[PDB]
Amino acid sequence: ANPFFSQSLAERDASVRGAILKELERQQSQVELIASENIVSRAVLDAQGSVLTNKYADEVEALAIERVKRLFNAGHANVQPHSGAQANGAVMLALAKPGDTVLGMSLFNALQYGVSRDTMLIDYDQVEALAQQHKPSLIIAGFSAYPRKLDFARFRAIADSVGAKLMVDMAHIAGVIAAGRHANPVEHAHVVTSTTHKTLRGPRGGFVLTNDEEIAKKINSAVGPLMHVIAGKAVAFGEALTDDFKTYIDRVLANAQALGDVLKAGGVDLVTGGTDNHLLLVDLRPKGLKGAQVEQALERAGITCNKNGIPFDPEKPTITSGIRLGTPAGTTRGFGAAEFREVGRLILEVFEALRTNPEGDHATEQRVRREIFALCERFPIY
């Protein structure tokens, strides 16, 4: 009988309502190709919007833990971190000493390894080379939005060779791993970290996995809490345990191949020449285009992505020679191969306009935007 309790946001707050509606329209009417973005289930929304917020100014945590352990075949889990970065931070604070040398990927004395200038593939001989050299206490695999498989066993071998622990940040590929469509790092790393959003299609947040009990205790110590968010994690982990999630990931992967092939046929390059996952790293050089200019034009055209510096990019970082695309969001809304090929066609249309007008072609962008709107309306969300 009390409106504080009875009335909706929509009924009470016109301005916020308006803002939410504009955001809904953004999500409904544009194609989201940002690789880290996704669209959560109504169930995850219900969790985040639950009365669990009114606490700790727990069953759901137990559920999240048991589910994630099952999902990734891990002996131990911590589902408390508020973010992937915070998970990573907790692990380092637990597995490393100040002044330690830590060897990580890039696409505490922080040392970086990357990919080969000539193949765009991970430098394993060179990762080892360099581990051997600098004697890191910790080696970190993953972390980077890399479009090819990671050889965790090889990473672990290298680790072992120099008396280092192996940490894997699977944040960019967690959903792929969960569906069994990528090697599971849990089987090879001393510790695994991840985000709960992105390809796991949950709320923003983190978690940590290990098979080692003593590592688990250190993790727990080194690591809110937002119980409604934890509920959301539980919901998402539960979803990922289902066959429907396996099918989702299957389509994500297939959709990335479809889109990638179209872009290549259309005369751009892909870093590493393709993908093993949901990620496409587009090299715009063959068309003499620039990352920032392309990102901007695509957005005007109703397609969102990220400019992206390619390995050994000849452009300064505010410019770049690439964009990064991912299929998770579009796949969630129901896109299949045909739809992603259409998206490709439209992207290529914008590319071609930019070749004679790098600053943008309004006419082309508008047409594309409208076609994007039409495509999206055939695949409604929420």
Next chain:
Amino acid sequence: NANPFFSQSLAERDASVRGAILKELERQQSQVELIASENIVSRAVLDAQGSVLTNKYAEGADEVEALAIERVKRLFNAGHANVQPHSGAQANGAVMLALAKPGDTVLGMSLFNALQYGVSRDTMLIDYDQVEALAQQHKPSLIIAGFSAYPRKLDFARFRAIADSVGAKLMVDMAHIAGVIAAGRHANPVEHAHVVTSTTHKTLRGPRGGFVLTNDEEIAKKINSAVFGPLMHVIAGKAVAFGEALTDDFKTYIDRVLANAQALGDVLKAGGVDLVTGGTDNHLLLVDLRPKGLKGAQVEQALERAGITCNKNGIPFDPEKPTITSGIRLGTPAGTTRGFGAAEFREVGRLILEVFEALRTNPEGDHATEQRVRREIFALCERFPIY
């Protein structure tokens, strides 16, 4: 929508999580929450937190943020605001780095070289001359006021004078009393502090989170740099709560919160326990259990079994270990939100006293009494349903 991913509720899809949610609802529905930092958010805030705004900035201004900013500025008559902090501690942390250099002495309340001031052993109140003497001696670069769950007014003007006298900045952490200030029922530290920090929950009845206020644009710039992925749905929740707080209805809420604390405190006092400072100027009650020879932990544990949640709380200069303590801390915000008035809080006080008395013979607990009180608590809450 045709797709169950989009069309079906949590209730329909996830029985186990739904069950957990229902259990939590029942906890909130059938117990009296007296934890002073706890509250019960509006359906509107829930809607925001459960909005599609979650599907943004996965890789780490915006309309909802601009709304939050406009609103909190108006609410606290502040020239500048940052609504990004994920917590009160995060807000405090950022301001400390803004305003203070490593190795600096910082002088803050307790009930960097971190130094503390408290209340007078004499008056059990802040002694501003004592605080000033500490400042003069230790020359802090930063003085922090608030922060502590102190049940009396804070003289921010005087804190500023003290700070000036030693060339220190003044920070006020108003987390524990933000709602009271928002309603105009406590002096506003924005008028006196270089910077003010707060949480968005507690007496502001929003989502968990923090914010930072200042009237000084240069400090604002520094704050913004210090504070810098965002939860847009949470920011929306902040916006909603700030909007609610701007209303006359919110002023009435605080009015009731305050009166309710007086009512509850009166009963406890008449019942033969003491209140630290002898009462309260806000929503807080610091109960001193010594007259009944009771301990905080034992009392907290017993009350919880009796369906009344509070925190054990060390009194100033508590002779007991901090895991034990000689007190409990109570607050009226949550109960007030569900509709309790003075009479209802007097009833709660009566029931609390029943538990105290059982414990005077059986400090480890009395099931009979606890379960009886629990039933009476259930019946009370039933008259004031939530959600």
